[PDB]
C-alpha cells in the first residue's frame, strides 16, 4: 500500500510463496488494484505505459528463471526484506512445521514453487501481450516462427565457425512447463505431508495447480476476452495434437 512498486512486490511474492491461495486471486484482485492505482497517478490515459512498465520489472526472462530455480536457490535469501519474508514464512509452514520430513520435502517444495511461478510468469506475459496488442501473433504462431527458426539454426553454426520478444518467451515457458509435467508423471510414485499434497495437485486436473486447471480456472475466465488467440494457443500447446 506504501508504493505501488513495493505493493506489487508484496503481492507477487505473496502469490508465489502462499501455495494454498489460488493464482486467480492475483489476477482478479492484485493486478486489478495495481491497474486502478496507475490510473489515478497517471490519468485516464498514458497509465498503461506505467502499468506495463511496472509489470515488466517483475517479468523474468527464461534465462533468469532457470538461474533463479537451479540448485534450490529460490529457498536462499532474497535481497529485499519484502520478498525475503514471504520466502521464510513458506519455509516455516512447509519445511519446518511438517514433522518427520523426508529429504524429498525440500525437492518437493521447489518443484511446486517452480511449476507455480511458471504459471505466474505466463500471467504477466499474457497481460503484457494484451497491453501491447500482440495477441494477433498467436493465430498461426508455428507458421510465423519459421523466420526466427532459421535464425536459431544459423546461430548454432556460429559457434563452431570463424576458425523483448514476449510471444517467444510465452512459448518457452510453456515448453518448460511441459517438461516439468512429463517428468513429474514419469517419476512414477505409484493433509498428507502438506507440502506433498500440493505436489500432487500439479498433475490433478481438478486443481488450479495443474495445467488443465490453470486453463479452466485462470486463463479462460480472466484472459479469454482480452487475449483470445494466446489462450487458444496455450490450449493447443498444452493439450497437444
Amino acid at each position: 500500500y506504501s508504493d505501488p512498486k513495493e505493493y506489487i512486490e508484496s503481492k507477487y511474492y505473496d502469490a508465489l510463496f502462499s501455495i494454498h491461495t489460488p493464482l486467480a486471486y492475483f489476477v482478479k484482485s492484485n493486478l486489478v488494484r495495481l491497474k486502478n492505482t496507475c490510473r489515478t497517478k497517471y490519468g485516464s490515459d498514458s497509465y498503461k505505459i506505467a502499468y506495463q512498465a511496472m509489470l515488466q520489472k517483475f517479468l523474468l526472462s527464461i534465462v533468469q528463471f532457470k538461474d533463479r530455480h537451479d540448485n534450490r536457490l529460490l529457498l536462499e535469501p532474497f535481497s529485499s526484506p519484502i520478498a525475503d519474508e514471504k520466502r521464510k514464512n513458506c519455509l516455516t509452514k512447509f519445511v519446518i512445521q511438517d514433522e518427520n520430513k523426508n529429504s524429498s520435502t525440500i525437492a518437493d517444495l521447489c518443484v511446486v514453487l517452480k511449476s507455480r511461478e511458471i504459471k505466474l510468469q505466463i500471467l504477466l506475459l499474457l497481460e503484457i501481450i494484451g497491453l501491447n496488442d500482440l495477441d494477433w501473433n498467436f493465430r498461426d504462431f508455428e507458421k510465423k516462427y519459421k523466420l526466427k527458426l532459421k535464425k536459431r539454426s544459423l546461430n548454432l553454426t556460429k559457434k563452431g565457425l570463424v576458425r523483448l520478444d514476449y510471444c517467444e518467451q510465452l512459448d518457452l515457458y510453456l515448453d518448460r512447463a511441459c517438461i516439468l509435467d512429463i517428468l513429474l508423471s514419469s517419476e512414477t510414485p505409484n493433509s498428507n505431508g502438506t507440502i506433498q499434497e500440493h505436489k500432487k495437485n500439479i498433475l490433478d486436473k481438478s486443481k488450479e495447480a495443474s495445467l488443465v486447471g490453470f486453463i479452466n480456472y485462470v486463463l479462460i475466465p480472466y484472459f479469454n476476452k482480452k487475449v483470445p488467440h494466446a489462450v487458444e494457443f496455450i490450449i493447443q500447446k498444452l493439450k497437444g495434437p
Binding site: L149, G160, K237
Partner: protein, 555 residues
C-alpha cells in the same frame, strides 16, 4: 583436396603404389563401425587388396571419439589411411591435430602419410576439400557442380574499412543438416569397372551397400538403381555349389516376407503401419479388410511362407497390383536383387540388409569403463557383420534374419505401447518421449536399440504434417542404476515417405544442437555415434538437459 570421378583410378594407383613399397603392412582402412554402405565398401576394397596381395588392415571406428584415439596410435609405417563412411563433414586436419609440415618427410607436395576420405555424407567440410593437401577426398562431383559460391567465400582467406559477408555464406552452408547423397560401394564399383575387376561378388557387395541406402535416403537408392539393374542385366553367363547367380525379381517392401508369413510381413512393416496405423485396433481391422478384399484368407496369410500354397504366391503379384493402391500402399510393389549360392535358397538384398542391421545391433545375443563393454560388444558386432559377407558363412546370415525378426517385434510392441499411451509430447523445436523401464527386451541398456525405437516412432506415428519434421528426443530411465539413456533423432527419408512439395525442416542442424548440450552435461556414459546421439546421465540431470535443449540457437 579432392579427386573427381575421373581421378578415381589415379588415386587408387597412388594407394597401390605407396602400399606396395614394402612387404610390411602400410595400408589401414578406418571403417565407420555401424553403417552397411561403409561395411561393404571396405569389404570390396579389402577383397581387391586381397585378390591382389596388398597387406591391408580393417579397423572399426564407432565415432569421432574413436577416430582421434585410433589415429594417434597409427604406427608411422602406415603411409596410406582410408576413412570410409565418415570424416568428410569435419575438418580432419584440425580434428586429428595434424601439422602438414610434420608429414612433409617428388612433385606437388608428398607426405609420409596420405589420408583418403571415402564418404557420401554432405556437406563437404571446406577445409578438407579446398584447404588440405594431405586430406584427399573421393568426390561425387558435388564439389565441381554445387560448391562454387562456397569455394569463393572460403578462398576469401584474407588476414590483413570495407566488409565481407562471406561469413554468412559459410554459415548457411554449415547450417544444412547432414545428408547422404551417394553410395560408397557404388563408387568403389565404379573404380573396379575402370580397372577391370568386376566379379559377381563385387556387384553383390555393390548392391548391398546401395540397398542399405533405401532405409533412410530412398531417393538416393532410386537414383542408383538403374545402373545396378544394368550391371545385373549385363552379366548373362548362360555350375558349382559356389556358383553365384544374381537375378532381378519382385522384392516387395514388406518385412522379411519370405522368412516369416504374408500376414506378419504386413503387420510388422513400418511402411504399412504408417499407412494403416496398426498400433491401435481400427487399423488392424483394415489390414484384415485388405486381405479379405484380396481374396486371401487370414489363416492362409498367417501360414509360414514355406507352407503357404504356391497358388497364392503366383497370384501375389497381380493381387498386389489391384488391391494395394486403394489403401495407399503401392510402394510395396518393388523389384529387387536376389543372390543364389549354388542350389540353396535365394536371399534378397533387402533381406540381406535386414540381417546385417540385426547383427550390427544385437549380434551377441562400475559405469566407469562400462563403455568398454559397449566398445568390445560393438567391434565384435562389426566382425560378425564382416564375416557375414563371406558367402560360405550362411549360418551367420540366417541368425541375423532371426535377430531382425525378434528385434522388430520387440520394437513394435514397445512403440505400440508408446503410441497408445500418447507419451510423445511436443515442444517447439523437438518432440520428447520419456520411457520408464520398458518391460520388453532389454531396458535399452543396449544403446543402438533406443535409436531404432526412435526411428520406429518417427516412421509409424501419424502426428499430422507440421510435426514429423520435428526431431525426437528419447529418454529411458534405468531404475536399477537410476540413470536416463537419452538419444536424439533427426527424421530421415525412408521408401514410403512422400517427398513432393514438402520442405526440409527449417532447423535441420538439430544434431548440432543436441551435441552442444551433451558437451556441457555430466554424462556418466558418453557415447559418440558420428551424428551426435546418445549419453547416459543421472535422473536429476534430465530436467536441465531438456530445458537447455529448448533454448538452442537463441542467444
Amino acid at each position: 583436396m579432392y579427386y573427381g570421378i575421373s581421378q578415381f583410378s589415379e588415386a587408387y594407383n597412388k594407394i597401390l603404389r605407396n602400399s606396395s613399397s614394402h612387404s610390411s603392412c602400410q595400408l589401414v582402412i578406418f571403417v565407420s563401425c555401424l553403417n552397411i554402405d561403409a561395411l561393404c565398401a571396405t569389404k570390396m576394397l579389402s577383397l581387391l587388396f586381397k585378390k591382389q596381395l596388398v597387406q591391408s588392415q580393417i579397423v572399426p571406428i564407432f565415432g569421432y571419439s574413436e577416430l582421434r584415439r585410433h589415429y594417434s596410435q597409427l604406427d608411422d609405417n602406415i603411409n596410406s589411411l582410408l576413412l570410409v563412411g565418415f570424416g568428410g563433414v569435419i575438418d580432419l586436419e584440425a580434428f586429428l591435430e595434424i601439422d602438414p609440415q610434420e608429414y612433409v618427410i617428388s612433385g606437388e607436395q608428398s607426405f609420409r602419410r596420405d589420408i583418403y576420405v571415402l564418404d557420401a555424407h554432405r556437406p563437404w567440410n571446406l577445409d578438407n576439400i579446398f584447404g588440405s593437401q594431405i586430406i584427399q577426398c573421393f568426390d561425387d562431383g558435388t564439389v565441381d557442380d554445387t560448391l562454387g559460391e562456397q569455394k569463393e567465400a572460403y578462398y576469401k582467406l584474407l588476414e590483413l574499412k570495407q566488409i565481407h559477408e562471406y561469413e554468412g555464406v559459410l554459415e548457411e552452408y554449415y547450417s544444412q543438416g547432414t545428408t547422404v547423397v551417394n553410395s560408397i560401394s557404388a563408387q568403389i564399383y565404379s573404380l573396379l569397372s575402370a580397372i577391370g575387376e568386376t566379379n559377381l561378388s563385387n556387384l553383390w557387395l555393390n548392391i548391398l551397400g546401395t540397398t542399405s541406402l533405401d532405409i533412410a535416403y530412398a531417393q538416393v537408392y532410386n537414383r542408383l538403381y538403374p545402373l545396378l539393374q544394368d550391371e545385373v542385366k549385363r552379366l548373362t553367363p548362360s555350375k558349382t555349389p559356389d556358383t553365384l547367380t544374381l537375378n532381378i525379381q519382385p522384392d516387395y517392401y514388406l518385412f522379411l516376407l519370405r522368412h516369416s508369413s504374408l500376414y506378419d510381413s504386413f503387420y510388422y512393416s513400418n511402411y504399412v503401419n504408417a499407412k494403416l496405423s496398426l498400433w491401435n485396433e481400427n487399423g488392424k481391422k483394415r489390414l484384415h479388410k485388405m486381405f479379405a478384399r484380396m481374396g486371401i484368407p487370414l489363416s492362409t496369410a498367417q501360414e509360414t511362407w514355406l507352407y503357404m500354397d504356391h497358388s497364392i504366391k503366383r497370384e501375389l503379384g497381380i493381387i498386389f497390383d489391384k488391391n494395394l493402391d486403394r489403401y495407399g500402399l503401392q510402394d510395396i510393389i518393388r523389384d529387387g536383387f536376389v543372390r543364389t549360392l549354388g542350389y540353396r535358397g535365394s536371399i534378397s538384398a533387402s533381406e540381406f540388409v535386414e540381417a546385417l542391421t540385426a547383427l550390427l545391433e544385437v549380434g551377441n545375443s562400475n559405469s566407469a569403463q562400462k563403455l568398454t563393454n559397449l566398445r568390445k560388444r560393438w567391434v565384435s558386432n562389426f566382425w560378425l557383420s564382416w564375416d557375414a559377407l563371406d558367402d560360405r558363412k550362411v549360418e551367420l546370415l540366417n541368425r541375423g534374419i532371426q535377430l531382425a525378426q525378434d528385434l522388430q517385434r520387440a520394437i513394435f510392441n514397445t512403440g505400440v505401447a508408446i503410441l497408445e499411451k500418447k507419451l510423445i509430447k511436443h515442444l517447439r523445436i523437438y518432440r520428447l518421449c520419456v520411457l520408464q523401464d520398458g518391460p520388453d527386451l532389454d531396458l535399452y541398456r543396449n544403446p543402438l536399440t533406443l535409436l531404432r525405437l526412435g526411428n520406429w516412432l518417427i516412421e509409424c506415428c501419424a502426428e499430422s504434417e507440421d510435426k514429423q519434421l520435428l526431431p525426437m528426443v528419447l529418454a529411458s530411465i534405468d531404475e536399477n542404476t537410476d540413470t536416463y539413456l537419452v538419444a536424439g533423432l533427426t527424421p530421415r527419408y525412408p521408401r514410403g515417405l512422400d517427398t513432393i512439395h514438402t520442405k526440409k525442416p527449417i532447423l535441420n542442424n538439430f544434431s548440432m544442437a543436441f551435441q552442444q548440450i551433451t558437451a556441457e552435461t555430466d554424462a556418466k556414459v558418453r557415447i559418440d555415434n558420428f551424428e551426435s546421439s546418445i549419453i547416459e546421465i543421472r535422473r536429476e540431470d534430465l530436467s536441465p538437459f531438456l530445458e537447455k535443449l529448448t533454448l538452442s540457437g537463441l542467444l
